[PDB]
Design a protein around this ligand. Structure first.
Ligand SMILES: *[C@@H]1O[C@H](CO)[C@@H](O)[C@H](O)[C@H]1NC(C)=O
Ligand SMILES: *[C@@H]1O[C@H](CO)[C@@H](O)[C@H](O)[C@H]1NC(C)=O
Lengths: 56, 202
């Protein structure tokens, strides 16, 4: 469920960033990034790292 | 006459597997003025890097930022010349639904001349299989056939490395080709793969 868990994280981070909670959105994205580094694809790891850069 | 830019219409975006996100639009009527096009982007409140379309491709822009999946971004085009600045209608989408995969490679017929009525196929899915679940479209025909026959798309509807084509005539040579796309139907079809051949034995 590694894929299933990563999609759940992206859902919370997208909810948080649109609600106006960027600090918690970064917290979720950092958890999702650690998952992609350990057991993930380059395409999804670059996606998370990109989203973090936009957050600033 | 010299006119301000028309509002850009028909804004679509496509993520070709391996390339960055590219978006296209219709610039509208000829303004007879040097017009600059910019593709603005953002996620939540946070803005992406602006994309300025090259002069050779004035209705297309390929962003500089890596493709981002499973979030909802907002895109729109901003056209401007000496006579005014207009923006298109904003679009909101998840780039995961705008993927055009690469066709599967290594298409081969494993058990040529083994069974009379069946031939098994194998291929290698594109790397984008890590993000989306692929649905396929397998076609086959005889060597002398003018039209292609279709494998029912309802069976080739989930990510898979192989397929066993049944109900083939004995000791006849067949050709196959396969394309793939997101199982939702939300995305773009890949091009056709390299053709694979095989014989059915007697
Ligand atoms: C359009 O872009 C060019 C870039 O060379 C710039 O020199 C020009 O001032 C721009 N014009 C407008 C109206 O933005
Ligand atoms: C499959 O395709 C790759 C890349 O085109 C090629 O290097 C390889 O030899 C092909 N065959 C197998 C069995 O991998």
């Amino acid at each position: 469920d590694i894929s299933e868990r990563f999609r759940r994280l992206m859902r919370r981070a997208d909810e948080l960033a649109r609600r106006g909670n960027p600090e918690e959105a970064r917290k979720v994205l950092e958890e999702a990034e650690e998952l992609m580094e350990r057991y993930g694809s380059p395409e999804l790891l670059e996606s998370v790292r990109m989203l973090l850069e936009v957050l600033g | 006459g010299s006119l301000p830019p028309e509002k850009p219409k028909n804004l679509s975006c496509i993520v070709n597997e391996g390339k960055k996100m590219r978006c296209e639009w219709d610039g509208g009527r000829e303004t007879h003025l040097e017009t600059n096009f910019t593709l603005k982007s953002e996620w939540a409140t946070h803005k992406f890097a602006d994309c300025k379309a090259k002069r050779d491709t004035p209705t297309s822009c390929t962003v500089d930022y890596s493709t981002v999946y499973f979030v909802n971004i907002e895109v729109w085009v901003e056209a401007e010349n000496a006579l005014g600045k207009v923006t298109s209608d904003h679009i909101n989408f998840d780039p995961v639904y705008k993927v055009k995969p690469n066709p599967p490679h290594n298409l081969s017929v494993i058990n040529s001349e083994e069974l009379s009525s069946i031939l098994k196929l194998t291929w290698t899915n594109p790397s984008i299989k890590s993000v989306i679940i692929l649905k396929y479209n397998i076609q086959y025909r005889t060597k002398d056939a003018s039209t292609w026959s279709q494998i029912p798309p309802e069976d080739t509807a989930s990510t898979r490395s192989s397929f066993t084509v049944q109900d083939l005539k004995p000791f006849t040579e067949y050709v196959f080709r396969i394309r793939c796309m997101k199982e939702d139907g939300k995305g773009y079809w890949s091009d056709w793969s390299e053709e694979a051949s095989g014989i059915t034995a007697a």
